[PDB]
Paper text:
Its SMC subunit is MukB, which associates with the kleisin MukF (Woo et al., 2009; Zawadzka et al., 2018).
To gain insights into how MukBEF interacts with matS sites during chromosomal unloading, we purified P. thracensis MatP, identified a cognate high-affinity matS site, and introduced the E1407Q mutation (hereafter, MukBEQ) into MukB to slow down ATP hydrolysis (Woo et al., 2009). We then reconstituted a complex of MukBEQEF dimers, MatP, and an 80-bp DNA oligonucleotide containing matS close to one end in the presence of ATP and magnesium ions. Focused classification and refinement produced a map of 3.1 Å resolution for the more rigid head module, with clearly resolved ATP and magnesium ions mediating head engagement. The clamp has a highly asymmetric architecture imposed by the kleisin MukF. However, the ν-MukB does not form the cap/cWHD interface, and κ-MukB does not associate with an MD. Within the clamp, all core subunits of MukBEF are in contact with DNA. The MukF linker is guided over the clamped DNA by the MukE dimer, which also binds DNA along its central cleft. The linker itself contacts the phosphate backbone with R322 and R327. The “larynx” of ν-MukB provides additional DNA contacts with Q1327 and R1328.
Numbering used by the authors:
A (entry chain B): 248 to 306
B (entry chain J): 1 to 135
C (entry chain B): 1138 to 1235
D (entry chain E): 2 to 213
E (entry chain I): 1 to 134
F (entry chain F): 9 to 80
DNA sequence: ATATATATATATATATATATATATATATAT
DNA sequence: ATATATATATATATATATATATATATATAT
DNA sequence: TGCCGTTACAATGTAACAGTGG
DNA sequence: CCACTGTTACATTGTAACGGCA
């Protein structure tokens, strides 16, 4: 009984910790990359919008 | 090196490559004897869940022919895997008729630029005509 | 991990995948799900595999008393049972010696 | 490929059928024997290959069934390839009494070991003495000869139940026995909290219990 | 029907396709029970070197849902096999960067032409512009 | 493991009925064409399968098959 | 009330695998 | 030119597993 | 409708060239 | 020099969607 319960508990602990370390890492990487890409995108949006009116009135 | 090398991923890639080659019938082993080749292939199969040992199996029984193809295929797979993240770095596969491709390749070799660059120049000249029509 | 950089997270995920390769060899369908979780075009697959793992550990619960289905919760009950069985084992060894 | 077990039979089913315990266990099951936790080897064998053996026995149009209490047995269907039979009403009475004794705390001192005398005493305590004797003999009115006849009938039914695995005689004594969880089947008509006339219909539909 | 169909060739094609799918894990047969599926796959494996019987094998044990995929795969194989004889009928495969492909496909969808026709038109317009300037 | 031809014999759809009739003591003669042919084909393995039960699968000189129980 | 069928245990003989000790021919140190 | 160590074959006999036959208890049915 | 050609992709494997650093 | 890496230009096979035609 001790052997079986210890084996099951160790299996549970190892699977849980490894799966969490496997997934949460890429999850946080995705979150950070998305935030950085949004921050970069806003500048292009603003500059494009300014050039839009500039060339709309320049003609 | 521009792309990070991940050991536990490339090892699995290499193992899958070996298994695919073998099941296709090619002689991945360097052994001419049937028995040793069969034993080495069986050991590689056992190595399915231990990609780390695949490097040692490669150094121990890999056919000397396949090193160049190995270093080519896994390198290309790494590039593609890292490029697949974003659309703007992906590649698109298209098929071209022989006359069209012949003309396009001759033009590209004339201008000394890649096919995508030549297509860019052509479509950009067309778009310049369109732009000046629009103004 | 929010402080870490892309390379560190990628390496950590690589190590975790290396561990899961050994931890999963016995299972067939969960192993297949892990293999499919490798695609970079479909990151959601990862989470699916994660759920599968839980959906596995949920069924590995032994008896009614261990039905804290949340696997992170049954660990404490298992350890309690281990302590109880340890004291019981000491008593049984004493009995056998006499 | 050919000359390969998977062509005809699953690997695990073949392993189960090739196990040393399979033939005796199969003969006992087809004979009507229930399997409880006491038969550690046979019970574990059934547990390991429960699905393989269930699908094997399905070929005979008989269901290998595990009751929630954890004891396996066979229930033939109407189209059974293995014949089917029903317990006598006295057998049902004695099985219900045995289940009661299993659940009765008053007999805790016995520690599970019971004598036919105690079983008969409990039977007469819970049942209708003379009207139960009526089945033993149609012309009984409390005659002690019919009393001994009823005792002998109870003993015979107890032996029959022993044959079914509901009861075990002690390794050296045939006058004492230990009850097994299989007896719980005798209460399958009351394990569900509904109208008796509906549970009976459910059971007879499921094949568990024909009427008399 | 443009390309004549040859039985001893297309049947070998079908056998190879089914063996490839089986090796890939695809369920070739319609039998959910593993024993019958294994028996049918063994029949197919030992059925090599036979058109007239691989056709019957397909008719009898082939998975219903793979019929369309196999049919279109054989269509493509026939067309490619017959077109690969001459240089001018062959097809050249290239990889285009996603922005370039996006713009090219935009033009092709806008004008109703195919990629080959679109590139032909673009090269011709470039030549005409060259002649205009020159 | 198990003998392959024995597994083939066990898996055959005729096996359940024939097995029940044999264990019931019934004698299978030449009249039962399907059963007789099955026993003819698979005797070498069914003899071992039923010897695992401490019973002997006997083909009489006349030809009919039957099961003879041992003492055990 | 007693014949009969059935399950269990023991004694007894068969057949096979295997370890032991001896005999014989050859190899190699003395 | 010799005697001891090795490898081979053989008979011995040791033990197990099997199958048979007999005795017993005893539970059924007329 | 169902077959049959045709296109536009996707996934993977390779050869050849260009870079980069040890 | 030399090796290892990134990239381009193919090939090879499979698949889904259109559209023609009996």
């Amino acid at each position: 009984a001790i052997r079986v319960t210890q084996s099951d508990r160790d299996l549970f602990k190892h699977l849980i910790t490894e799966a969490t370390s496997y997934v949460s890492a890429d999850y946080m990487r995705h979150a950070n990359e998305r935030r950085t890409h949004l921050d970069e995108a806003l500048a292009l949006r603003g500059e494009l919008f300014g050039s839009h009116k500039q060339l709309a009135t320049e003609q | 090196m521009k792309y990070q090398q991940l050991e536990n991923l490339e090892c699995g890639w290499k193992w899958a490559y070996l298994i695919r080659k073998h099941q296709e019938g090619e002689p991945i082993t360097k052994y001419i004897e049937n028995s040793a080749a069969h034993a080495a292939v069986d050991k590689l199969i056992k190595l399915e869940s231990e990609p780390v040992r695949v490097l040692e199996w490669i150094e121990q029984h890999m056919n000397p022919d396949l090193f160049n193809r190995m270093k080519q295929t896994i390198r290309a797979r790494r590039k593609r895997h890292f490029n697949a993240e974003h659309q703007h770095t992906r590649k698109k596969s298209i098929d071209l008729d022989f006359p069209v491709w012949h003309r396009l390749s001759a033009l590209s070799q004339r201008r000394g630029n890649t096919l995508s660059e030549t297509i860019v120049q052509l479509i950009e000249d067309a778009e310049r005509k369109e732009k000046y029509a629009n103004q | 991990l929010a402080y870490m950089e892309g390379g560190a997270l990628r390496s950590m995920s690589d190590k975790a995948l290396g561990a899961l390769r050994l931890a999963v060899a016995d299972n067939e369908h969960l192993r297949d799900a892990l293999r499919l979780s490798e695609d970079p075009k479909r990151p959601e697959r990862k989470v699916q595999f994660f759920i599968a793992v839980y959906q596995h550990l949920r069924e590995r619960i032994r008896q009614d008393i261990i039905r804290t289905d949340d696997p992170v919760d049954a660990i404490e009950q298992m350890e309690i049972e281990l302590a109880r069985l340890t004291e019981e084992l000491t008593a049984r060894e004493q009995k056998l010696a006499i | 490929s050919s000359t390969h077990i998977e062509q005809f039979m699953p690997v695990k089913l073949a392993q189960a059928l090739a196990n040393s315990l399979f033939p005796e266990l199969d003969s006992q099951l087809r004979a009507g024997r229930h399997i409880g936790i006491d038969d550690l080897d046979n019970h574990a064998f059934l547990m390991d290959f429960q699905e393989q053996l269930e699908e094997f026995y399905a070929r005979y149009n008989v269901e290998l069934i595990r009751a929630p209490e954890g004891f396996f047995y066979l229930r033939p269907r109407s189209t059974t390839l293995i014949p089917r039979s029903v317990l006598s009403e006295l057998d049902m009475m004695v099985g219900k009494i045995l289940c009661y004794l299993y659940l009765s705390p008053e007999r805790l001192a016995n520690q599970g070991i019971f004598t036919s005398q105690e079983l008969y005493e409990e039977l007469i305590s819970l049942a209708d003495e003379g009207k139960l004797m009526k089945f033993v003999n149609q012309r009984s009115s409390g005659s002690d000869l019919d009393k001994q006849k009823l005792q002998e009938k109870v003993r015979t039914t107890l032996n029959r139940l022993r044959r079914l695995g509901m009861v075990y005689f002690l390794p050296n004594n045939n006058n004492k026995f230990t009850i097994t969880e299989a007896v719980f089947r005798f209460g399958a008509d009351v394990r569900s909290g509904d109208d008796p006339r509906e549970i009976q219909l459910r059971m007879i539909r499921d094949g568990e219990a024909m009427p008399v």
